[PDB]
């Protein structure tokens, strides 16, 4: 997205916010690189974030935002419906249901792929 290539990235904190380990040690006492929120800089092991290997690869190439920082990729807002924002299971971008193309009135069932990822 043109607006992801444009917001600067915060200084990463080299500690997992969930388990307090570093890149040297996750919850299984194995090394694992962190991913860091572009807006707040806080970090997590992909395994602590419960991300699949495939999702992990994709988010490391994007201006990834944590759960609380996530803004809608269409309207750039969080807003009153923030908590019901959908997260793409391919790239982890957020979309309000009403901001999807086409707009949705009910929550999708199962794994959900966003308008950017779907072919």
């Amino acid at each position: 997205l043109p607006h992801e290539k444009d917001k600067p990235v915060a200084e990463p904190i080299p500690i997992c916010s969930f388990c307090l380990g570093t890149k040297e040690q996750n919850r299984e006492k194995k090394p694992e690189e962190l991913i860091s929120c572009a807006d707040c800089g806080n970090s997590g092991h992909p395994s602590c974030l419960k991300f699949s290997p495939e999702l992990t690869v994709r988010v490391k190439a994007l201006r990834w935002q944590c759960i609380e920082c996530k803004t809608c990729s269409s309207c750039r807002d969080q807003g009153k419906n923030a908590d019901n924002m959908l997260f793409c299971d391919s790239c982890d971008r957020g979309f309000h249901m009403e901001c999807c193309d086409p707009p949705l009135t009910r929550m999708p069932k199962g794994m959900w792929i966003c308008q950017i990822c779907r072919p």
């Binding site: 500690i15 969930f18 307090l20 609380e68 019901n84 299971d89 069932k109 959900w112």
Partner: peptide, 25 residues
């Protein structure tokens, strides 16, 4: 689908913030 709300729950809680600051120092 995952939402912000359901992802918050399914991920599990963050560690106590005082413990994170203690490790950051």
């Amino acid at each position: 689908a995952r939402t912000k709300q359901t992802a918050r729950k399914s991920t599990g809680g963050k560690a106590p913030r005082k413990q994170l600051a203690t490790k950051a120092a």
